[PDB]
Design a protein around this ligand. Structure first.
Ligand SMILES: NC(=O)c1ccc[n+]([C@@H]2O[C@H](COP(=O)([O-])OP(=O)(O)OC[C@H]3O[C@@H](n4cnc5c(N)ncnc54)[C@H](OP(=O)(O)O)[C@@H]3O)[C@@H](O)[C@H]2O)c1
Ligand SMILES: Nc1nc(=O)c2nc(CNc3ccc(C(=O)N[C@@H](CCC(=O)O)C(=O)O)cc3)cnc2[nH]1
Ligand SMILES: [Mn+2]
Ligand SMILES: [Mn+2]
Ligand SMILES: [Mn+2]
Ligand SMILES: [Mn+2]
Length: 159
């Protein structure tokens, strides 16, 4: 099974200038909780944005060019990325925009954080078709001293 996990600001913005400008520790904790001990697939720009391997996960990087770091696994196509995960229950696709576009048609589950924040951005999560997806979990949180925006954690499963 393939799942996508992402945090979306208003208008499905996910990034600006190869960064995420907000800081929501509770959402990073949710990301870790849902990805630990699973393979994670990311594109090269997201690898550079994170800037180091994510511990406790098999890190697989998509790039058309040869890899430059043997602490992670480098692959050259979608099918190779999936194969490099092996026989696991759940593969997590962690972006960015271009990568999410390619894996969306293959995904059964979306783990989305909707952040109440207006962000100028240059990268968006794919327009997906709402009729294709059933919301199976949602949990809203108001802003607090550690998290400066309200946010909603949602899990959607392909109908
Ligand atoms: N809010 C969130 O949840 C979230 C999550 C992830 C990322 N982001 C943000 O998203 C932005 C990065 O997204 P992006 O769309 O610019 O880039 P991306 O999807 O991370 O990376 C694109 C790169 O991945 C490689 N690639 C993708 N598909 C490939 C394929 N089928 N075969 C071979 N290589 C392939 C290519 O690398 P080469 O050029 O080397 O061939 C391509 O240039 C940043 O702002 C980041 O902060 C946000
Ligand atoms: N829900 C969600 N939120 C995000 O912010 C997110 N970001 C990315 C891409 N960017 C990043 C940037 C940093 C880390 C990161 O350092 N994660 C640590 C958390 C511990 C910490 O630095 O506080 C990790 O171990 O996963 C992960 C993804 C991909 N999917 C996401 N999904
Ligand atoms: Mn091929
Ligand atoms: Mn197999
Ligand atoms: Mn949203
Ligand atoms: Mn806000």
């Amino acid at each position: 099974m393939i799942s996508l996990i992402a945090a979306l600001a208003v208008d499905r913005v996910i990034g600006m200038e190869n960064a995420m400008p907000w800081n929501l520790p509770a959402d990073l904790a949710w990301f870790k909780r849902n990805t630990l001990n699973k393979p994670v697939i990311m594109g090269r720009h997201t690898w550079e944005s994170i800037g180091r391997p994510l511990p406790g996960r098999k890190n697989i990087i998509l790039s058309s060019q040869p890899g430059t770091d043997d602490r992670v696994t480098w692959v050259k196509s979608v099918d190779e990325a999936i194969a490099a995960c092996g026989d696991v229950p759940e593969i997590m696709v962690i972006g960015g925009g271009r990568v999410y576009e390619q894996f969306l048609p293959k995904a059964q589950k979306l783990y989305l954080t909707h952040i109440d924040a207006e962000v100028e951005g240059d990268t968006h999560f794919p327009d997906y078709e709402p009729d294709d997806w059933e919301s199976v979990f949602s949990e809203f949180h108001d802003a607090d001293a550690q998290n400066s925006h309200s946010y909603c954690f949602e899990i959607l499963e392909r109908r």
